[PDB]
Amino acid sequence: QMVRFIRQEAEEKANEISVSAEEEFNIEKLQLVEAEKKKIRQEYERK
Amino acid sequence: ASRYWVVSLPVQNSAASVWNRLQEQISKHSFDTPLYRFNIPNLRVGTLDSLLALSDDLVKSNSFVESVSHKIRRQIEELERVSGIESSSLSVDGVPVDTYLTRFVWDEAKYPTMSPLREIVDGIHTLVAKIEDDLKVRVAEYNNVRSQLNAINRKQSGSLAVRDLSNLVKLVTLLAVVPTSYVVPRSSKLLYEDLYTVTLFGRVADNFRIAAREKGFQIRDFEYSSEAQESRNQELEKLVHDQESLRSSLLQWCYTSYGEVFSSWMHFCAVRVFAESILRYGLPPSFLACVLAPSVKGEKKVRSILEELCG
């Protein structure tokens, strides 16, 4: 009966991994969307 | 084997009917004494001090001969496959015991130098020591082979405390429990019989633990793959075969070295003939004694004959 439960456990592990990846995705996106107001002070403000 | 059994009598102290009768036509024929000898003097002999030094070193020479004899009689025979070298195969100085003891031809240039034997005796002793060292090397090789023998094959034949992978069934583990229903697919039966297998499954540890060690008698773990056990058994068989071959082929070389040691002992007896001649007669080597392995009655008769030079 736990043969099908193995699939459920694998699905739960994959869902947890995907949830962690998505949670870090917002931070990764904000790492570039934000703080560029500082990097533009060197990329173009130097000009 | 047999220790030294040579008689002591110079040329001037022959115990036979005549001085030259020691070799043949002696009264020993009537008593069936196997005594026989043949002269083989060296080129020259040392002085009185040299004779005394040789007599002193004769004790060490006899000790070395005894050590070689003990090694040859023990290492070869104990292997139960090296004692196949008979008297002819182990002939001393190229002649069997019938002829080796009847002559001193071993005094040729092989072990000694066919020269004043004061240092030639030491040289022959060193050669015999080298031969004994080779025999000891062969014995050590035989011991290492026996260490290779009694290998992993000495363990149990599977489904037991040791080497149980040979009887493995190859979520499950090698249990072989010698004298279950749950969510897990416990409806199974492994091939772990050399023993018995029980219903178990890795999906839920309840059935697996119950079958393995939970109740009754705990099972014995073993390697999962029987290929490793088969390889270990094959290696053990190969090591046993190699040990047997060494006891039959390398120990055949050991038996050849034992025959060489017998030749060295014949040379030592030839030297001891001249040593006794110097001790109880003049310096030049000349002896009329004999070397054999007679019975008690024959030795007593020889002593009665030679009582003119008793100790």
From TrEMBL, chain B:
Q: Name one Pfam family in it.
A: V-ATPase_C
Q: What are the entry keywords?
A: Hydrogen ion transport, Ion transport, Transport
Reading the lineage from the top rank, the first entry is: Eukaryota
* Cellular component, GO, one term: vacuolar proton-transporting V-type ATPase, V1 domain
UniProt key word Methyltransferase: no
- CDD domains for this protein: V-ATPase_C
Matching InterPro entries, A to Z?
Answer: ATPase_V1-cplx_csu, Vac_ATP_synth_c_sf
Instruction: Please list the GO terms describing molecular function.
Output: proton-transporting ATPase activity, rotational mechanism
Please give the family membership noted in the entry.
Belongs to the V-ATPase C subunit family.
Q: How does it assemble?
A: V-ATPase is a heteromultimeric enzyme composed of a peripheral catalytic V1 complex (components A to H) attached to an integral membrane V0 proton pore complex.
What does this chain do? Subunit of the V1 complex of vacuolar(H+)-ATPase (V-ATPase), a multisubunit enzyme composed of a peripheral complex (V1) that hydrolyzes ATP and a membrane integral complex (V0) that translocates protons. V-ATPase is responsible for acidifying and maintaining the pH of intracellular compartments and in some cell types, is targeted to the plasma membrane, where it is responsible for acidifying the extracellular environment. Subunit C is necessary for the assembly of the catalytic sector of the enzyme and is likely to have a specific function in its catalytic activity. Subunit of the peripheral V1 complex of vacuolar ATPase. Subunit C is necessary for the assembly of the catalytic sector of the enzyme and is likely to have a specific function in its catalytic activity. V-ATPase is responsible for acidifying a variety of intracellular compartments in eukaryotic cells.
What this protein is called in its record is V-type proton ATPase subunit C
Question: Which species is listed as the source?
Answer: Citrus unshiu (Satsuma mandarin)
